[PDB]
Amino acid sequence: CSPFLSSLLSPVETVPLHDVTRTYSTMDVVDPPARYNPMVPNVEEEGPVACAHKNGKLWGVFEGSEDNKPPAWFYRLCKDLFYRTNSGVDPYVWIPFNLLDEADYHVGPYRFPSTATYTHEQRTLLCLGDTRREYVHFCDSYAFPGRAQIPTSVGTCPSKLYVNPKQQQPVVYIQLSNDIPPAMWLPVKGTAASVRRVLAEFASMAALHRDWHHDEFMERHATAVRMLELQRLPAGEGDILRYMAYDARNAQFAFAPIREFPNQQEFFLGEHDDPEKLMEHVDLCPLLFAIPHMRTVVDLHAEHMIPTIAGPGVATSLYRCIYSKALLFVQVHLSSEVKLPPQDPEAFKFMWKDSQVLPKMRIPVFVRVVWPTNERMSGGGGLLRRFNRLFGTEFASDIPVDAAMALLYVMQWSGHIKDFLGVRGMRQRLADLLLASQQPEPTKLYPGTREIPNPEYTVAERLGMHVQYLAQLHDPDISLTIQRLLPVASAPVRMGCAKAALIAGDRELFRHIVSSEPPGRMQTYMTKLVRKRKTRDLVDAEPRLLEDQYEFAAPLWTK
Amino acid sequence: YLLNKDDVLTRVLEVVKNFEKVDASKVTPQSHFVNDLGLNSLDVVEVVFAIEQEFILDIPDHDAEKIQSITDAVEYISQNPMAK
Amino acid sequence: RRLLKAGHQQLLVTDKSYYARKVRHEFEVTARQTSARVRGIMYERGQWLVENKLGGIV
Amino acid sequence: ATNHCADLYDHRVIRAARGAHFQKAVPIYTLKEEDGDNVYGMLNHILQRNDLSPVCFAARDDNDATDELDDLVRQLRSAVKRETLSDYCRNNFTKSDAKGQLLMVGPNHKRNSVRRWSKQLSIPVTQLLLDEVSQTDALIAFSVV
Amino acid sequence: ESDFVDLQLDDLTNALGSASARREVGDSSELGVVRENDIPEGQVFSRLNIPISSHQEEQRTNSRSALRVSASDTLEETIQQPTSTGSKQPLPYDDERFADMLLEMEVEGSLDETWQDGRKAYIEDVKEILEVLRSLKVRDICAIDVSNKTSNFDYMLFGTCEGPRHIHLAAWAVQEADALKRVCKIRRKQVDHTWEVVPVGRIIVNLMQESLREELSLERKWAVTKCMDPLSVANAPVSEGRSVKAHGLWTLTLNLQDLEDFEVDYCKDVLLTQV
Numbered sequence A: 001c002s003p004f005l006s007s008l009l010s011p012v013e014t015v016p017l018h019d020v021t022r023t024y025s026t027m028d029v030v031d032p033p034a035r036y037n038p039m040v041p042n043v044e045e046e047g048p049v050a051c052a053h054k055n056g057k058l059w060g061v062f063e064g065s066e067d068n069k070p071p072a073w074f075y076r077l078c079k080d081l082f083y084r085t086n087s088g089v090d091p092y093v094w095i096p097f098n099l100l101d102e103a104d105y106h107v108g109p110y111r112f113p114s115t116a117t118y119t120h121e122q123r124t125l126l127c128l129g130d131t132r133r134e135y136v137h138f139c140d141s142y143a144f145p146g147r148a149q150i151p152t153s154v155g156t157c158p159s160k161l162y163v164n165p166k167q168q169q170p171v172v173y174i175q176l177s178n179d180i181p182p183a184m185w186l187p188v189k190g191t192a193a194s195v196r197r198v199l200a201e202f203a204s205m206a207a208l209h210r211d212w213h214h215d216e217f218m219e220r221h222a223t224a225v226r227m228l229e230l231q232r233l234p235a236g237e238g239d240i241l242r243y244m245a246y247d248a249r250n251a252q253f254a255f256a257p258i259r260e261f262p263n264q265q266e267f268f269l270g271e272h273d274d275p276e277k278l279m280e281h282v283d284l285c286p287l288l289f290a291i292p293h294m295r296t297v298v299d300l301h302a303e304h305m306i307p308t309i310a311g312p313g314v315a316t317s318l319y320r321c322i323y324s325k326a327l328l329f330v331q332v333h334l335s336s337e338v339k340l341p342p343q344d345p346e347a348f349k350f351m352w353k354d355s356q357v358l359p360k361m362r363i364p365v366f367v368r369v370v371w372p373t374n375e376r377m378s379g380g381g382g383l384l385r386r387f388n389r390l391f392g393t394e395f396a397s398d399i400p401v402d403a404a405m406a407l408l409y410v411m412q413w414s415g416h417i418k419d420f421l422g423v424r425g426m427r428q429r430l431a432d433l434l435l436a437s438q439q440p441e442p443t444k445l446y447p448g449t450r451e452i453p454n455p456e457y458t459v460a461e462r463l464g465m466h467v468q469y470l471a472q473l474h475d476p477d478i479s480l481t482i483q484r485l486l487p488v489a490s491a492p493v494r495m496g497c498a499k500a501a502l503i504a505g506d507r508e509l510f511r512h513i514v515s516s517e518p519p520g521r522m523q524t525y526m527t528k529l530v531r532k533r534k535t536r537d538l539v540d541a542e543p544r545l546l547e548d549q550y551e552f553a554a555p556l557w558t559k
Numbered sequence B: 001y002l003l004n005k006d007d008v009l010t011r012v013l014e015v016v017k018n019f020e021k022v023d024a025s026k027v028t029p030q031s032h033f034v035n036d037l038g039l040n041s042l043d044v045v046e047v048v049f050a051i052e053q054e055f056i057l058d059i060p061d062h063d064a065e066k067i068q069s070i071t072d073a074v075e076y077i078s079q080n081p082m083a084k
Numbered sequence C: 001r002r003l004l005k006a007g008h009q010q011l012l013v014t015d016k017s018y019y020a021r022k023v024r025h026e027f028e029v030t031a032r033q034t035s036a037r038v039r040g041i042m043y044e045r046g047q048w049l050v051e052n053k054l055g056g057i058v
Numbered sequence D: 001a002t003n004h005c006a007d008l009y010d011h012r013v014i015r016a017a018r019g020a021h022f023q024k025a026v027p028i029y030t031l032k033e034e035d036g037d038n039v040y041g042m043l044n045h046i047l048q049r050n051d052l053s054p055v056c057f058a059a060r061d062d063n064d065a066t067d068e069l070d071d072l073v074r075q076l077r078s079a080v081k082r083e084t085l086s087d088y089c090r091n092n093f094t095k096s097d098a099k100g101q102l103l104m105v106g107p108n109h110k111r112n113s114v115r116r117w118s119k120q121l122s123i124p125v126t127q128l129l130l131d132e133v134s135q136t137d138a139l140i141a142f143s144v145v
Numbered sequence E: 001e002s003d004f005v006d007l008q009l010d011d012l013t014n015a016l017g018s019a020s021a022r023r024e025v026g027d028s029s030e031l032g033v034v035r036e037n038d039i040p041e042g043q044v045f046s047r048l049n050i051p052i053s054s055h056q057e058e059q060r061t062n063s064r065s066a067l068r069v070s071a072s073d074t075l076e077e078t079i080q081q082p083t084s085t086g087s088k089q090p091l092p093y094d095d096e097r098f099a100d101m102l103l104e105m106e107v108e109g110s111l112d113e114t115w116q117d118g119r120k121a122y123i124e125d126v127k128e129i130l131e132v133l134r135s136l137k138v139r140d141i142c143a144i145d146v147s148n149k150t151s152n153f154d155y156m157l158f159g160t161c162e163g164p165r166h167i168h169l170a171a172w173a174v175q176e177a178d179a180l181k182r183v184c185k186i187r188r189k190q191v192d193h194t195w196e197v198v199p200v201g202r203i204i205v206n207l208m209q210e211s212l213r214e215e216l217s218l219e220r221k222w223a224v225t226k227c228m229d230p231l232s233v234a235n236a237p238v239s240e241g242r243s244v245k246a247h248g249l250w251t252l253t254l255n256l257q258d259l260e261d262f263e264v265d266y267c268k269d270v271l272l273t274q275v
């Protein structure tokens, strides 16, 4: 009674393949080549409160107000924000306030951008159950730099301030940008000091980001100018911005600010035959700067990025959030495979040389949200708890709403909202895979063989890969789960458990798994996985007598 | 304040019995380290320092060179006010 | 006794058992092998060790 | 041969077979999961290809023991037909055209092999038993089967 | 207090759309979060990435410097010292002029200003190597600080291993403990099955068997060896040369062949001070 369990047991049955005995119609075939069509477009009534505002009865619609004049708390808040009463300047730290007039207010409901692709239920949840609910934009407080601009620049698009005309308590909603729905508008009290502190948090974060990375960004700017001069390319402002966003690829890994901020959390974005599409989706996100700190083009057909059982590793990219200056560390893992290579490559090549259908690839992508300790930048714990209870996600109580909405928008635009999950979702998927392994499995195209293996993924391989994913997601009981799952595991599942223990960092458990593994190609590859002294240190459980002596590797592989 | 000689004798007897050189049955409550037990003077220092390990009190060098028998060790701890 | 007590007072990483064994071996075999003048030299050097914290034995 | 059987080229195996390895009539395969062969995938392919019926003979009957996987699933969240050999042969061999047979013989050291066969095999497997020879020796049991 | 509006006031409007009850979800949302504890700026790490809480002295302990001396002077003590020094008496060293000049330089403290070296090792690394060897079950671990003495290393560790296999295992474990800052690995083939030498910065590690350890006796040597004294160069030079009467006018003749290793270790400075 689960969607993922149903997808495991009964597949989609897309493409049929006829034979002399059966018809294998359930195969995860690679999508056809994409085609760009110029004919296909890219984009793809006034309410009562607004009418009363137009007629002049907005203060009458206001509940806590007089039938003629604005509310007392609202008038006091406007006076304080206009005269800086209660609490050559730096524009990054300074918090302006542009109060609008009654004829200048913007009364109406939240209108999603023309490119915002959300379902009806998702738009309802982002509008908090009422899409027709209208707000009154009256002032703009703080500006953030443009997406395409250098991340260390002054703000140009100001954040908006709304007030719900009909509410019981004084609430001011702070919207960072048009891409943030009212479900993530920061609800602050009617206190001018509260608004000032909420905006000063973002101001201080922007000032810190500038002071930390402006010199590096300007050095990259100079490098881009010099490289344009060398390559004889046109030298303009947009050209330099594009070349900086490109050299984000050539940026080195050692000098990347991956651990710039204290707190961090992990999320699983699903498995992709071509994770470059998801990477392009992340690159084209309105809530992230177009010039990332580091970019890695995942090309599975490159000799250094071919996914193997002891694969090349992890392709890493680092993006910066525009409004909260948090970090998104995208990690494409090319080493999660638990399938052994063919014993004779010539036969496998003869078998798959002329085949016009290739199976899907299961390549995991993770994202690490890195953020600093904040008290008023995440909108309090209640905002994120509401977001979690609404969208079935597992976010921390202090993760910035900017990064939260960035991840949500990216996953929804890519179409993997079901694949986007955390530790709880990964545990549920692991339970589903255990149930699927208990159930009988359907027949694939042809049975696997050490000589000619089957490229299609089986339930045991999926279970091993998901054990690896649960270890990667920093599960606190990952070692206990591996210990409980090892006695009832197959060979690919034990390989996945070894990789998962190695990822979690339990060298003793890894050595136990390697010593319990019976001798074979699986044991050889799980020994080759790590940097070791001698293979016997991992393979031999009991010390093998060598020259009337006994070696001991427990101190070498403990902790 | 002053510990009874019975409890002080039980501790020092357990040390000399569990010692690396003194045999179990060879020890007696009235014995000498060098003559009755057959130890050297360098071993007398070790059995004295072993007693100072269980009795937190610190013995000066002059008072330590006087303890050459188990009877002297019991009487010293008895009169010592630092007998824990 | 001074050497043994000083070692057990300030002997952090070095094995106290091994230190006592080394001191016993010295006092028991090295002096009995060498001459009396070298015995006195060893006595003076042991006093120097007691006064200078075992000569750097950490 | 599956599930960690003794090596086919062991000296005792050779002495007991006496040339059964050098023949060409009956092919003998070794499906080792640690090398990349999916034993049950291959067996289900054989079943669906040749339209066989799976029977299984365990030297020892399965014991009433729970599976750790159920408790593991609960932590992460928060029927075999027994038929005697004689009457089975009677009911399945008297008809004109009978399906081929896939016989899985094994000694149950852990007493769960029948359950795991039924779980990992489609076309629910039949359990072959001996009425008066219930608890017998593995050699004579396998010979009769 | 919080600057944001009532979380319950927001949940009241959210529950009409959520239609669910969320309870005890903060723990399940936090169990995946990682918090990094901050580190003080003043806290520095050793060569093995270990915090340091014990300070040291940049000068030598054997020094005699007025700046190092912390005891307050006294007029009566100065008068007594002057009345004592009123009687001229030369120093026991050979070169009287050189001995007086060296003592003056020592009490002035310019020797320490010239020999100031902040590249000293740390006892935290010695303790870490000790713990690694204890895990490897290496018997009789003996560490000696020879920074004050004439040597090339600050700390010398000595361990007893039983067999070439155990020796190589302990060497590889010390290497992997030093993996953070090491630049090379140990020799793969053992050229000596009874002795292994692992350099860790200014800390050296010797892994020997019982026989070779008792034969070398390096720990007793480095313990008996006195600390460096600048007055030692005031002694007479020594050089092995047979004269017509086995006596040098400005040099000394001492033969260490008739002396054992322990005799040499105990009398090296004694003979130089005597003759």
Ligand SMILES: *P(=O)(O)OCC(C)(C)[C@@H](O)C(=O)NCCC(=O)NCCSC(=O)CCCCCCCCC
Residues within 6 Å of the ligand: B040, B041, B042, C022, C023, C026, C027, C028, C031, C032, C039, C040, C042, C043, C044, C045, C046, C049, E219, E220, E223, E224
């Ligand atoms: P007791 O009377 O039974 O025995 C007393 C001793 C001194 C043990 C004699 O029996 C004895 O053995 N005498 C041998 C000759 C002698 O007097 N030896 C005196 C010892 S010399 C000395 O003091 C050595 C100190 C050197 C410092 C050793 C430190 C080593 C650090 C590694």
